[PDB]
Design an enzyme around this catalytic site. Structure first.
Site, PDB file in Angstrom:
ATOM      1  N   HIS A   7       0.818  -1.186   0.000  1.00  0.00           N
ATOM      2  CA  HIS A   7       0.000   0.000   0.000  1.00  0.00           C
ATOM      3  C   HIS A   7       0.871   1.263   0.000  1.00  0.00           C
ATOM      4  O   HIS A   7       0.337   2.374  -0.169  1.00  0.00           O
ATOM      5  CB  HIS A   7      -1.041  -0.064   1.078  1.00  0.00           C
ATOM      6  CG  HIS A   7      -0.612   0.329   2.455  1.00  0.00           C
ATOM      7  ND1 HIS A   7      -0.551   1.669   2.888  1.00  0.00           N
ATOM      8  CD2 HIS A   7      -0.278  -0.426   3.502  1.00  0.00           C
ATOM      9  CE1 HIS A   7      -0.177   1.657   4.227  1.00  0.00           C
ATOM     10  NE2 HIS A   7       0.007   0.379   4.558  1.00  0.00           N
ATOM     11  N   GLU A  13      19.096   6.851   8.712  1.00  0.00           N
ATOM     12  CA  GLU A  13      18.419   8.044   9.237  1.00  0.00           C
ATOM     13  C   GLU A  13      18.128   7.972  10.714  1.00  0.00           C
ATOM     14  O   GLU A  13      17.735   6.892  11.210  1.00  0.00           O
ATOM     15  CB  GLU A  13      17.023   8.209   8.542  1.00  0.00           C
ATOM     16  CG  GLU A  13      17.084   8.740   7.143  1.00  0.00           C
ATOM     17  CD  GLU A  13      17.370  10.214   7.053  1.00  0.00           C
ATOM     18  OE1 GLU A  13      17.787  10.795   8.062  1.00  0.00           O
ATOM     19  OE2 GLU A  13      17.120  10.820   6.008  1.00  0.00           O
ATOM     20  N   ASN A  72      17.156  11.695  12.681  1.00  0.00           N
ATOM     21  CA  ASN A  72      16.238  12.781  12.422  1.00  0.00           C
ATOM     22  C   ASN A  72      16.028  12.924  10.931  1.00  0.00           C
ATOM     23  O   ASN A  72      16.995  13.217  10.201  1.00  0.00           O
ATOM     24  CB  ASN A  72      16.827  14.118  12.951  1.00  0.00           C
ATOM     25  CG  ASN A  72      15.823  15.231  12.874  1.00  0.00           C
ATOM     26  OD1 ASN A  72      15.050  15.425  11.987  1.00  0.00           O
ATOM     27  ND2 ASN A  72      15.727  15.955  14.003  1.00  0.00           N
ATOM     28  N   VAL A  92      16.959  16.461   9.322  1.00  0.00           N
ATOM     29  CA  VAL A  92      18.299  17.030   9.536  1.00  0.00           C
ATOM     30  C   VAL A  92      19.335  16.063   8.960  1.00  0.00           C
ATOM     31  O   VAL A  92      19.253  14.848   9.284  1.00  0.00           O
ATOM     32  CB  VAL A  92      18.564  17.286  11.054  1.00  0.00           C
ATOM     33  CG1 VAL A  92      19.974  17.880  11.146  1.00  0.00           C
ATOM     34  CG2 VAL A  92      17.491  18.245  11.644  1.00  0.00           C
ATOM     35  N   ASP A 114      -0.013  -7.558   1.714  1.00  0.00           N
ATOM     36  CA  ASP A 114       0.469  -6.158   1.754  1.00  0.00           C
ATOM     37  C   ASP A 114       2.023  -6.088   1.902  1.00  0.00           C
ATOM     38  O   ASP A 114       2.604  -5.796   2.984  1.00  0.00           O
ATOM     39  CB  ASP A 114      -0.243  -5.351   2.875  1.00  0.00           C
ATOM     40  CG  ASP A 114       0.037  -3.837   2.736  1.00  0.00           C
ATOM     41  OD1 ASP A 114       0.576  -3.435   1.707  1.00  0.00           O
ATOM     42  OD2 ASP A 114      -0.261  -3.141   3.753  1.00  0.00           O
ATOM     43  N   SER A 160       1.457   1.059  16.487  1.00  0.00           N
ATOM     44  CA  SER A 160       1.944   1.802  15.301  1.00  0.00           C
ATOM     45  C   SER A 160       0.877   2.744  14.831  1.00  0.00           C
ATOM     46  O   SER A 160      -0.320   2.682  15.237  1.00  0.00           O
ATOM     47  CB  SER A 160       2.334   0.771  14.236  1.00  0.00           C
ATOM     48  OG  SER A 160       1.216  -0.028  13.840  1.00  0.00           O
ATOM     49  N   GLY A 182       1.998   6.680   8.816  1.00  0.00           N
ATOM     50  CA  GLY A 182       3.422   7.011   8.552  1.00  0.00           C
ATOM     51  C   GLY A 182       4.449   6.011   9.032  1.00  0.00           C
ATOM     52  O   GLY A 182       5.612   6.073   8.640  1.00  0.00           O
ATOM     53  N   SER A 235       3.606   2.863   8.324  1.00  0.00           N
ATOM     54  CA  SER A 235       3.294   1.792   7.351  1.00  0.00           C
ATOM     55  C   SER A 235       4.525   1.404   6.575  1.00  0.00           C
ATOM     56  O   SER A 235       5.326   2.267   6.138  1.00  0.00           O
ATOM     57  CB  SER A 235       2.267   2.220   6.381  1.00  0.00           C
ATOM     58  OG  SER A 235       1.002   2.129   7.099  1.00  0.00           O
ATOM     59  N   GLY A 236       4.642   0.096   6.347  1.00  0.00           N
ATOM     60  CA  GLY A 236       5.798  -0.376   5.503  1.00  0.00           C
ATOM     61  C   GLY A 236       7.018  -0.755   6.356  1.00  0.00           C
ATOM     62  O   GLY A 236       7.923  -1.453   5.888  1.00  0.00           O
TER      63      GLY A 236
HETATM   64  C1  LIG Z   1      -6.571   6.684   8.957  1.00  0.00           C
HETATM   65  N1  LIG Z   1      -5.466   5.898   9.520  1.00  0.00           N
HETATM   66  C2  LIG Z   1      -5.980   4.750  10.314  1.00  0.00           C
HETATM   67  C3  LIG Z   1      -4.864   3.973  11.035  1.00  0.00           C
HETATM   68  N2  LIG Z   1      -3.761   3.786  10.054  1.00  0.00           N
HETATM   69  C4  LIG Z   1      -2.747   2.930  10.538  1.00  0.00           C
HETATM   70  C5  LIG Z   1      -1.589   2.763   9.789  1.00  0.00           C
HETATM   71  C6  LIG Z   1      -0.597   1.918  10.252  1.00  0.00           C
HETATM   72  C7  LIG Z   1      -0.770   1.230  11.426  1.00  0.00           C
HETATM   73  C8  LIG Z   1      -1.926   1.331  12.173  1.00  0.00           C
HETATM   74  C9  LIG Z   1      -1.998   0.505  13.456  1.00  0.00           C
HETATM   75  N3  LIG Z   1      -2.637   1.276  14.537  1.00  0.00           N
HETATM   76  C10 LIG Z   1      -2.887   2.217  11.708  1.00  0.00           C
HETATM   77  C11 LIG Z   1      -3.266   4.937   9.258  1.00  0.00           C
HETATM   78  C12 LIG Z   1      -4.470   5.464   8.511  1.00  0.00           C
HETATM   79 CA   LIG Z   2      18.784  12.736   8.799  1.00  0.00          CA
END
Ligand SMILES: CN1CCN(c2cccc(CN)c2)CC1
Ligand SMILES: [Ca+2]
Ligand SMILES: [Cl-]
Length: 223
Positions: free
Chosen positions: A40, A52, A54, A57, A84, A172, A175, A177-178
């Site tokens: 996704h 990485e 920061n 920076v 996924d 989690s 952002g 994700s992945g």
């Molecule tokens: C609208 N949001 C809903 C929650 N999402 C999410 C993304 C990754 C991990 C988790 C695990 N909590 C949730 C991001 C998109």
């Molecule tokens: Ca950096």
């Protein structure tokens, strides 16, 4: 990551940021030339950022390398997020060092209760929005398949598992994700989806990497 802690610079040296003019997803370096992330997260024009801490920076340990190809899993279903997972090949090999390191693939599936490390630059609030500049970490156990499927009836496949805390507070989030879920020194999960973040009875859902090991090794051997 909600409810986690500041990892420490370069303490998770297989964590990468995927950048298309901004950070948009995590990934995990699995050898000098390949990253695995979430399907996704696909887009064209990805730059992989290694080393990485920061992400806003330049601190002096980064490597920035454009992807030469992306490979989404052949059965990825964007409707359900089943399968996924994607592979990204770097245009040139990463320089491997103490701060830029690969993470091993599972030789088998991890059990319920195994403690894992989940990491990323995603939102740190369960309500509202705050994004960190430095990498955030969370230790969270794998949940039983029954508590996972209870929490999300009709949505969990054999290619997903849940990790976290049914009581909420630690999870989690967007952002992340992945990015990686590492357990016993193997990449067992990829941050995939959930219902909000850190809410009661809504743990994070992760792509079950141990189901993909053959596909990963075959796909990178042929590409
Ligand atoms: C609208 N949001 C809903 C929650 N999402 C999410 C993304 C990754 C991990 C988790 C695990 N909590 C949730 C991001 C998109
Ligand atoms: Ca950096
Ligand atoms: Cl397999």
């Amino acid at each position: 990551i909600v409810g986690g802690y500041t990892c420490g610079a370069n303490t998770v040296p297989y964590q990468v940021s995927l950048n298309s003019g901004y950070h948009f997803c995590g990934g995990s370096l699995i050898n000098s030339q390949w990253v695995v992330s979430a399907a996704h997260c696909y887009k064209s024009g990805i730059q992989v950022r290694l080393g990485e801490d920061n992400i806003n920076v330049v601190e002096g340990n980064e490597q920035f390398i454009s992807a030469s190809k992306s490979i989404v899993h052949p059965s990825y279903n964007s409707n359900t997020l089943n399968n996924d997972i994607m592979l990204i090949k770097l245009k040139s090999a990463a320089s491997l060092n103490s701060r830029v390191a690969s993470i091993s693939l599972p030789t088998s599936c991890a059990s319920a209760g195994t403690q894992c490390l989940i990491s990323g630059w995603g939102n740190t609030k369960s309500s509202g929005t705050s994004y960190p500049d430095v990498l955030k970490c969370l230790k969270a156990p794998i949940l039983s398949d029954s508590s996972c499927k209870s929490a999300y009836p009709g949505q969990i496949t054999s290619n997903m598992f849940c990790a976290g805390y049914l009581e909420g507070g630690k999870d989690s989030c967007q952002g992340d994700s992945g990015g990686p879920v590492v357990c016993s020194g193997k990449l067992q999960g990829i941050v995939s989806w959930g219902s909000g973040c850190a809410q009661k009875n809504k743990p994070g859902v992760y792509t079950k990497v141990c189901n993909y090991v053959s596909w990963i090794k075959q796909t990178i051997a042929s590409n």
